[PDB]
Design a protein around this ligand. Structure first.
Ligand SMILES: CCCCCCCCCCCCCCCCCC(=O)OC[C@H](COP(=O)([O-])OCC(O)COP(=O)([O-])OC[C@@H](COC(=O)CCCCCCCCCCCCCCCCC)OC(=O)CCCCCCCCCCCCCCCCC)OC(=O)CCCCCCCCCCCCCCCCC
Ligand SMILES: CCCCCCCC/C=C\CCCCCCCC(=O)OC[C@H](COP(=O)(O)OCCN)OC(=O)CCCCCCC/C=C\CCCCCCCC
Ligand SMILES: CCCCCCCC/C=C\CCCCCCCC(=O)OC[C@H](COP(=O)(O)OCCN)OC(=O)CCCCCCC/C=C\CCCCCCCC
Ligand code: HEC
Ligand code: HEM
Ligand code: HEM
Ligand code: HEM
Ligand code: HEM
Ligand SMILES: CC(/C=C/[C@@]1(C)[C@H](C)CCC(=O)[C@@H]1C)=C\Cc1c(O)c(Cl)c(C)c(C=O)c1O
Ligand SMILES: CC(/C=C/[C@@]1(C)[C@H](C)CCC(=O)[C@@H]1C)=C\Cc1c(O)c(Cl)c(C)c(C=O)c1O
Ligand SMILES: CC(/C=C/[C@@]1(C)[C@H](C)CCC(=O)[C@@H]1C)=C\Cc1c(O)c(Cl)c(C)c(C=O)c1O
Ligand SMILES: CCCCCCCCO[C@@H]1O[C@H](CO)[C@@H](O)[C@H](O)[C@H]1O
Ligand code: FES
Lengths: 241, 61, 49, 101, 380, 81, 98, 108
């Protein structure tokens, strides 16, 4: 009834306290999202400008955003009107509102992936295991129509049919697009997405340890220095006789 | 003897003491910064955009 | 009486340089302070940063 | 049956206030009666109790204790305040009762 | 007249007369450094707080995204958000040790200093609570719903009291704006009362580990304790920053990454770590009002401590039995926290009721009893 | 206000102290410091540790026992057809 | 004067005038297949509409109506024995029962 | 001891700064602005909070929130008023409080 399989712990290149994200793997992750997931999954808090200097060149980013139609307005007659995207636009929502999103996924609501790796226990370890973990239901388990069996998803019946399969796309950087190769990449992306600071946050953490180390020491001496007066202190009771 | 040279010239006069802290903090910064960034970037070879960069930066078209 | 009163032995705690009862403690002062003040000067620099 | 004795002496070493050289009475928390009692202590008994305490505090700041030899012994602990305090508390109960009458 | 301008000036005479020429026992241990840390937190929280308030937007349709924007766009916003949220935790860690110390060393015999303390604790709790509601995430919402619903246990004026709380007839925008107002305000009331806390203190002076008058040996706060506190600061600061910088979300529930849904209560709904122990007790009593009362009492019981003191000595330094009981109590809370983080199913439910029953007995019955006992063993 | 001068009445106590610049900051780290760190650890570890170690078990138990109750007992379906 | 000024300020917290007092909601019993529960947004908090199988309709009517915290028989709680409708709000402290 | 008005660390304050306070027997009405100024502060602060509980700091919502605060919030309109006009009477009062000081050399 309340049984569940927990995902394992893969050794991500960005797992270390001092390990930055592999920006090469993130550029790919993006491609995966852009050409596969963005079909049902929104990413409301990221924007084309965010890719600049992280995974793409300014040229690239701008063209990447001009590949989309963006509603704007009103004009002079208070009329909405399409237009090409600017680097300041947010990634395109594939549905106008949840109601319609469910309406085209069997009533299932594909969550916005912006903060996903932090909204699910397991983070990328989970997301990964789930993407690559689809399989056949065991003896005695009947999966409702329209649903799929995944042991990693709580309830084992997930509404998302396996999104990735070998060569489903082609990394223009020449990396063998096997299935786990993809999943591995897109997960690395969903991390960068849920927290762009990541890299800088750790570079700081480094500086913090060094100064913290050096400083705690200096002050420990100074504290002992002053206190010595009281530490060495000697007293005697010489009542008069 | 630096300790004496330093004490006599820097640490004695509470006014020169301050100049040392400022002048020092400035040097300390500029260096501690490079060093750390240098340690960090090294620990992450080929992963930062600083590295990938050359592949698309004015290399194509 | 105050004549029978003497300052105990602080050898267990004295700095190496002022351990000998027959050497002017004055020569090593400049250092003893320069070092302690250098630790403080640094703490200030580390904090200032 | 020396049981109560056996126990008391145990608890006494358990407490450990003797490791600082304090008599069982130097540890009493100073409420109103204790304060009065102490004012009735003879000059010398008060000056000794003071040193014992000022010495125990100095130990505590240093994070040390007395060398085993100098520890107070369960049977050599002088209850220097106990009798004064009991009178203070007896004088007080009289007043208290007399004001209800 | 007054020679120095440190003892006469109507103001500096204060900075000096309450933190520089202040008489401090020479033997206060590290357990006394929490006062300042608590103080420092307050200023740090307040500061990082304002910085955030300058980007937040109290409105259901905009709360969640404002915070999100505050992080992804505001320069260093992400860092400030972290510091503010993790300060909340280190604030509670510190306050808990601050309390333990008081308990273990009978500082509660300083009644007013103590009672204002308890008031402080309750205020900090209320504050941290409403802060946690501002980002309007899943916990934010359901937390807001359950806690305001607590008044519903008060007969008559109950169901009404809930109406104000919400400003409507179900959590919504008004609740979120009057919560932001409330959060913005309380911290100051905290800072205010803190001043009184410290003022009552000053009448008597600090207590010390051996619990015997330290008049025979006082020392000037500065440089003894000012330096000791600077150090005590750089120590707490290290793991606080190691945590906030290397593992940001370690200490926090993830449900709050999902915008509030008025129709779905997450199945794994827990409160922030520092409230678990109470949440644990609430889930013990299987009756609406009983659980509520037990919860209230789980904190309000602090007001009774001063009155349940039977030992003839002040601290537990020389009371080995009280010590064991004291540490047995700590492990006792440590358990309730674990329980609070587990589902309402066996064996937990039973272990739960136990630890609770255990909590209230060690405080109302045991301590005062073992205390009396100990007095007899000293022959008093 | 001022409390330095009222505090208490003390007589016959001499105290000698040395400036900080004449002595060592952290002296006898081995012969004195560590020995006491150990001294203290010992005296206290048996009043503190016990109850913690105790709660630990209760934690490990209740945890593993909640897991056991998840697994199935064959004796339920060894009659089914 | 005082009582009156408090009267006012205190009701400045109550529900405003814009807070409604709305209508109903229609639902097709053909969207809710047998053996399932469904949630509809309504008057603020959730609203359940459950199509019960008779496999259940028996349990709910076969219980000690005297050993209940709140004693009521499944029959006078619902009209059609296959459709149980209720406000999805725990009566304890307001969370939504799963 | 004796009275709990002069010893208590708190009441000794309410009493030592507004009840046993030594006041010249001839201060005129131009001395009443101190308290009025004070009273304003508390009144402003109070009505202010009440409003902050319905305001929404955002360009696309500031104006309409104040408008809503008045037309919908019970007695909101009154509170809005009191707060806005208190701002004025506060200034009036502070101006007389200043003149008084100027005309009677209190600036000494
Ligand atoms: C550096 C820490 C000191 C190391 C130590 O244990 O000293 C033993 C020893 C000194 O021996 P000692 O004089 O007998 O010790 C007495 C004091 O404990 C000597 O210690 P102290 O009195 O000089 O220093 C006190 C200090 C000691 O710091 C600690 O206990 C740690 O504690 C504080 O200042 C309080 C700050 C606590 C902050 C924690 C924040 C809460 C977050 C929780 C998550 O130092 C060494 O062995 C040398 C190490 C270099
Ligand atoms: C409430 C929810 C809080 C969540 C749980 C957090 C608990 C964290 C884990 C326990 C941390 C305690 C660290 C152990 C320190 C061990 C130690 O040093 O013990 C010995 C040492 C020596 O004793 P003395 O006789 O004074 O020495 C002088 C003569 N030689 O004892 C002490 O340090 C004194 C006790 C310090 C208090 C620490 C208690 C921990 C905090 C718990 C909160 C308890 C209060 C209830 C709050 C209700 C809300
Ligand atoms: C439903 C109907 C509404 C009910 C209202 C709630 C009831 C409130 C309880 C009233 C109980 C009053 C008790 C006071 C008795 C104390 C006392 O000693 O008398 C007053 C005592 C004076 O004593 P004596 O007259 O010299 O002699 C005593 C006779 N043996 O104190 C005084 O100076 C009283 C002065 C009263 C007027 C001051 C207030 C005027 C202020 C102006 C602004 C007012 C409006 C704004 C209020 C809004 C606040 C948010
Ligand atoms: C056909 C639309 C579609 C595509 C394409 C798709 N997903 Fe989904 N995804 C869904 C649906 C529907 C759900 C909701 C499942 C549910 O809750 O029943 C979902 C849910 C998820 C969840 C986990 C939800 C949870 O509750 O744990 C993740 C993570 C996710 N998808 C990731 C991806 C990734 C990564 C890709 C791209 C490689 C992808 N999806 C592509 C439809 C899709
Ligand atoms: C805003 C919260 C608080 C702050 C900032 C604060 C601050 C202070 C400060 C700075 C001290 C002096 C130094 C010290 O001895 O630690 C102190 C002492 C004290 N506080 Fe607090 N405190 C807070 C909460 C509490 C709480 C919750 C209690 C009660 C449960 C409490 C009980 C005490 C007591 C009893 C003293 C005297 C300590 C002694 O015996 O030496 N405080 N507090
Ligand atoms: C008593 C000191 C304070 C405590 C205990 C505290 C605690 C909190 C908590 C627990 C949160 C939720 C953090 C999260 O997990 O996202 C929070 C958020 C916030 N607090 Fe505070 N806060 C304090 C003071 C302040 C003050 C005075 C301000 C501003 C002047 C402030 C403004 C906010 C804002 C805007 C947020 C919401 C957005 C966010 O979470 O980043 N806080 N506070
Ligand atoms: C928040 C603003 C202020 C408040 C609430 C306030 C309040 C007070 C109060 C209650 C008094 C005592 C009674 C009285 O003599 O009026 C006082 C006195 C005084 N205030 Fe202000 N004040 C404020 C602003 C100012 C300003 C703007 C000035 C200076 C330009 C000023 C100058 C004085 C002086 C000189 C006194 C002594 C009056 C005397 O000679 O009797 N005050 N103030
Ligand atoms: C120094 C005392 C105060 C003064 C001088 C003051 C003054 C003002 C002024 C001039 C306005 C514009 C009024 C208008 O609509 O014409 C205003 C509005 C407002 N104030 Fe204050 N205020 C004070 C205290 C407060 C505080 C502390 C709060 C809340 C805790 C507050 C909250 C607001 C809000 C929400 C508004 C904007 C909406 C409105 O105008 O009704 N005020 N205040
Ligand atoms: C809040 C504080 C100290 C704060 C700082 C801010 C100083 C004013 C300057 C240097 C620092 O950085 C300290 C942390 C001390 C609180 C404080 C007290 O109020 C009192 Cl009565 C005592 C007896 C102590 C004893 O340790 C104490 O720590
Ligand atoms: C810990 C607690 C309440 C604590 C208060 C109410 C004290 C009893 C008094 C002072 C305060 O302000 C605290 C917030 C309630 C338990 C509690 C929570 O905290 C939270 Cl966040 C949630 C989401 C639930 C859900 O069921 C809960 O039961
Ligand atoms: C702010 C105030 C009084 C306020 C109230 C609020 C009292 C506390 C209780 C009764 C009232 O209603 C007064 C208006 C007085 C200010 C005030 C002062 O601070 C001082 Cl030093 C003086 C010498 C005066 C002389 O007249 C004064 O009026
Ligand atoms: C007490 C511990 C203090 C730690 C101080 C570390 C200061 C953080 O240093 C930060 O490093 C970043 C990356 O290198 C830079 O981008 C920031 O501008 C810089 O402020
Ligand atoms: S069990 Fe408490 S709200 Fe449902």
């Amino acid at each position: 009834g309340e049984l569940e399989l927990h995902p394992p712990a893969f050794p991500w290149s960005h797992g270390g306290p001092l390990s930055a994200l592999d920006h090469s793997s993130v550029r790919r992750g993006f491609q995966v999202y852009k050409q596969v997931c963005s079909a049902c999954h929104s990413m409301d808090y990221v924007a084309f400008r965010n890719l600049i200097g992280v995974t793409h060149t300014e040229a690239e980013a701008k063209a990447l955003a001009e590949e989309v139609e963006v509603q704007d307005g009103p004009d002079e007659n208070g009329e909405l009107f399409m237009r090409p995207g600017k680097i300041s636009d947010y990634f395109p929502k594939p549905y106008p509102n949840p109601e319609a999103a469910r309406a085209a996924n069997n009533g299932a609501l594909p969550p916005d992936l912006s903060y996903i790796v932090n909204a699910r226990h397991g983070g990328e370890d989970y997301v990964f295991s789930l993407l690559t973990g689809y399989c056949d239901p065991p003896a005695g388990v009947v999966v409702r129509e329209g649903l799929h069996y995944n042991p990693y998803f709580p309830g084992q019946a997930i509404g998302m049919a396996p999104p990735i399969y070998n060569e489903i796309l082609e990394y223009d950087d020449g990396t063998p697009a096997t299935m786990s190769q993809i999943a591995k990449d897109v997960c690395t992306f969903l991390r960068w997405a849920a927290e762009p600071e990541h890299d800088q946050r750790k570079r700081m953490g480094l500086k913090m340890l060094l100064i913290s180390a050096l400083l705690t020491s200096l002050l420990y001496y100074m504290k002992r220095h002053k206190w010595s007066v009281l530490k060495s202190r000697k007293m005697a009771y010489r009542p008069p006789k | 003897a630096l300790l004496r040279q330093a004490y006599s010239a820097l640490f004695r006069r509470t006014s020169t003491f301050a100049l040392t802290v400022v002048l020092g903090a400035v040097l300390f910064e500029r260096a501690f910064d490079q060093g750390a960034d240098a340690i960090f970037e090294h620990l992450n070879e080929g992963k930062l955009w600083k590295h990938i960069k050359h592949k698309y930066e004015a290399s194509e078209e | 009486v105050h004549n029978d009163v003497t300052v105990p032995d602080f050898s267990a705690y004295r700095r190496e340089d002022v351990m000998d009862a027959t050497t002017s403690s004055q020569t090593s002062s400049e250092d003893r302070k320069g070092f302690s003040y250098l630790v403080t000067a640094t703490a200030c620099v580390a904090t200032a940063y | 049956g020396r049981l109560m004795d056996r126990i008391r002496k145990w608890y006494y070493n358990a407490a450990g206030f003797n490791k600082y050289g304090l008599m069982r009475d130097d540890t009493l928390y100073e409420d109103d009666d204790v304060k009065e009692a102490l004012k009735r202590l003879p000059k010398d008994l008060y000056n000794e109790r003071m040193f014992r305490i000022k010495r125990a505090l100095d130990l505590s700041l240093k994070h040390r204790i007395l060398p085993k030899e100098q520890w107070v012994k369960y049977e050599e602990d002088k209850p220097y305040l106990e009798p004064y305090l009991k009178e203070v508390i007896r004088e007080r109960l009289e007043r208290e009762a007399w004001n209800k009458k | 007249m007054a020679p120095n301008i440190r003892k006469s000036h109507p103001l500096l005479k204060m900075i000096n007369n309450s933190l520089i020429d202040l008489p401090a026992p020479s033997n206060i241990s590290a357990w006394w450094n929490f006062g300042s840390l608590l103080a420092v937190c307050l200023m740090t929280q307040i500061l990082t707080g304002l910085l955030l308030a300058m980007h937040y937007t109290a409105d259901t349709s905009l709360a969640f995204s404002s915070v999100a924007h505050t992080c992804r766009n505001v320069q260093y916003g992400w860092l400030i958000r972290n510091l503010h949220a993790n300060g909340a935790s280190f604030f509670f860690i510190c306050i808990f040790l601050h309390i333990g110390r008081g308990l273990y060393y009978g500082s509660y015999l300083y009644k007013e200093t103590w009672n204002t303390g308890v008031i402080l604790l309750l205020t900090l709790m209320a504050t941290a609570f409403v802060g946690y509601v501002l980002p309007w995430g899943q916990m934010s919402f359901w937390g807001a719903t359950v806690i305001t619903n607590l008044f519903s246990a008060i007969p008559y004026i109950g169901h009404t009291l809930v109406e104000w709380a919400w400003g409507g007839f179900s959590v919504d925008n008004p609740t979120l704006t009057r919560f932001f107002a409330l959060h913005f305000l309380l911290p100051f009331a905290i800072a205010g009362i803190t001043i009184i806390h410290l003022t009552f203190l000053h009448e008597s002076g600090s207590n010390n580990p051996l619990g015997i008058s330290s008049d025979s040996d006082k020392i000037p706060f500065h440089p003894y304790y000012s330096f000791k506190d600077i150090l005590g600061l750089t120590l707490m600061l290290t793991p606080f920053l190691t945590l906030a910088l290397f593992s940001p979300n370690l200490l926090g529930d993830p449900e709050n990454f999902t915008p509030a849904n008025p129709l779905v209560t997450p199945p794994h709904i827990k409160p922030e770590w520092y409230f678990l122990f109470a949440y644990a007790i609430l889930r013990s009593i299987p009756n609406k009002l009983g659980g509520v009362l037990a919860l209230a009492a789980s904190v309000l019981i602090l007001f009774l401590i001063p009155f349940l003191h039977k030992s003839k000595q002040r601290t537990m330094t020389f009371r080995p039995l009280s010590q064991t009981l004291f540490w047995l109590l700590v492990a006792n809370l440590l358990i309730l926290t674990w329980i609070g983080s587990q589902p309402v199913e066996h064996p937990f439910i039973i272990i739960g009721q136990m630890a609770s029953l255990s909590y209230f007995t060690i405080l109302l019955i045991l301590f005062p009893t073992i205390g009396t006992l100990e007095n007899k063993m000293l022959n008093y | 206000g001022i409390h330095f001068g009222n505090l208490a009445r003390v007589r016959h106590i001499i105290t000698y102290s040395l400036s900080p610049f004449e002595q060592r900051a952290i002296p006898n780290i081995f012969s004195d410091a560590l020995p006491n760190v150990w001294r203290r650890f010992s005296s206290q570890v048996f009043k503190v540790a016990p109850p913690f170690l105790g709660a630990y078990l209760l934690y490990s138990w209740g945890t593993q026992e909640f897991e056991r109750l998840k697994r199935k007992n064959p004796a339920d379906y060894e009659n089914d057809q | 004067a005082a009582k009156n000024v408090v009267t006012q300020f205190i009701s400045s917290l109550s529900a405003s005038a814009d807070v409604l007092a709305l209508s109903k909601i229609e639902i097709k019993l053909s969207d809710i297949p047998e053996g399932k529960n469904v949630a509809f947004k309504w008057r603020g908090k959730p609203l359940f509409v459950r199509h019960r199988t008779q496999a259940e309709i028996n349990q709910e009517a076969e219980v000690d109506v005297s050993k209940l915290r709140d004693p009521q028989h499944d029959l006078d709680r619902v009209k059609k024995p296959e459709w149980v409708i209720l406000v999805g709000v725990c009566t304890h402290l307001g969370c939504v029962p799963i």
